Amino acid sequence: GSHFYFLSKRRRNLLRNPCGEEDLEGWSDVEHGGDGWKVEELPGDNGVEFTQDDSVKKYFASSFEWCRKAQVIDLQAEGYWEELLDTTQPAIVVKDWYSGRTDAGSLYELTVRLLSENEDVLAEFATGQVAVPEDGSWMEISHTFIDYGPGVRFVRFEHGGQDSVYWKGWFGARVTNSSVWVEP
């Protein structure tokens, strides 16, 4: 019956369609560079298996110019009261998984912002451009926002990838299993 108990019980991934099971539905500000985003089934051509969740069967593949996509989550509509967010400032945990092919290098970027109701940027985590592992292995990136102050209403998740070779097709970074949740 404590708050810790309820927030633990209500913890769930607030991002829609994290793996591409619904194609691009639920993603906004979609930028299709080169040949655009494409959804592929695991394990990818010249790629490795997703040993970590098993319910993950698909990923998004990028191309030869930047492919980006974003989602904005309304924390209040998901039932996190403004008073709770202002006073307790519970942990907002962001994770993403990325990999590349073994026949070509690639690059990935993630930018996550906490936003007020008027879209003021209250906190920001940005990777910059990251070199994807050459060996095809899946890598997790994780960030926890805490002590971010009052006023947080939205989380804007944005990520992207491109290849390092400039080749027609889908040789860029692959992303999947993206998540945002609130934990005590």
Ligand code: NI
């Ligand atoms: Ni309790």
